[PDB]
Specification:
Rossmann fold; 2 domains; 6 strands; binds guanosine-5'-triphosphate; hydrolase; GTP complex; beta sheets
Length: 252
């Protein structure tokens, strides 16, 4: 067909099989989730969007899935990120120093995937799904991430870390999942400090991006929630990752 209904990419190929396999694999590796029934997880995931209009998804839709994917996360080792998820994941992979959303069962199930159904048919739409700007923000994928991110942020305590992409326009972007949901759902009773690591992209020698206006905005927002803010530059992420693997080392 030469023109699609929505402006976004459509459901990821073999979505149901992909999601089921991820659930099997996650529940094999992580013993606290050893017991989860993956068919049921898939059935609750499907329940959230199938047969529903994909511009009319609500956080309620995902509550069955949220219950099934209930999980403890070490609250003081949370790493949040904005537009730099590969480095976040490479870092937590070394020795599990922190945990991102994609280290939880639900974040691992959905990472990199797209999905949406059709009102009053039970088909998955593999041709297009709503684009958040053009069509609607209340679509299956957006609503999932807003729902699961808010719960993850509510679970954090003590010092929470966030990696931000210092190669971008808006280092802190108030429209991102981190800026629109997670910053506002950290609980000040529990969270002492949000520490941002601003990841440089920029050829070696660079500015102190902790002075960027958007980082000052983030400091202001966080400080006014009664949480302390700290920021550090990571000037050379490749050197950082190496120091994480081999800290005894080479000019770390
Ligand atoms: N793994 C993961 N994906 C997320 C998270 N929050 C949003 N996403 C998804 O990541 C993908 C890319 O989002 P972005 O790079 O921020 O680009 P964008 O925000 O969609 O820009 P627009 O298309 O104009 O809305 C989309 O599927 C998002 O829904 C999250 O916390 N973790």
């Amino acid at each position: 067909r030469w023109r699609q209904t929505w402006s976004g990419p459509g459901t990821t190929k073999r979505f149901p099989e992909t999601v089921l396999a991820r659930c099997v694999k996650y529940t094999e590796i992580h013993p606290e989730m050893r017991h989860v029934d993956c068919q049921s997880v898939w059935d609750a995931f499907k329940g959230a969007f199938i047969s529903k209009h994909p511009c009319d998804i609500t956080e309620e839709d995902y509550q069955p899935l949220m219950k099934l994917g209930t999980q403890t996360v070490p609250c003081n080792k949370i790493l949040l990120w904005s537009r730099i998820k590969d480095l976040a994941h490479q870092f937590t992979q070394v020795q599990r120093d922190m945990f991102t959303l994609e280290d939880t069962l639900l974040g691992y199930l959905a990472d990199d995937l797209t999905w949406c159904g059709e009102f009053d048919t039970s088909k998955i739409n593999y041709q297009s799904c709503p684009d958040w700007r053009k069509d609607c923000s209340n679509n299956p994928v957006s609503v999932f991430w807003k729902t699961v991110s808010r719960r993850f942020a509510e679970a954090a305590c003590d010092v929470v870390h966030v990696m931000l992409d210092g190669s971008r326009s808006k280092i802190f972007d108030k429209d991102s999942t981190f800026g629109s949901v997670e910053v506002h759902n950290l609980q000040p009773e529990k969270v002492q400090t949000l520490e941002a690591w601003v990841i440089h992209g920029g050829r070696e020698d660079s500015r102190d991006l902790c002075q960027d206006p958007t980082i000052k905005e983030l400091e202001s927002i966080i400080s006014k929630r009664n949480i302390q803010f700290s920021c550090k530059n990571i000037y050379r992420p490749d050197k950082f990752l190496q120091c994480v693997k081999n800290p005894e080392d080479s000019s770390c």
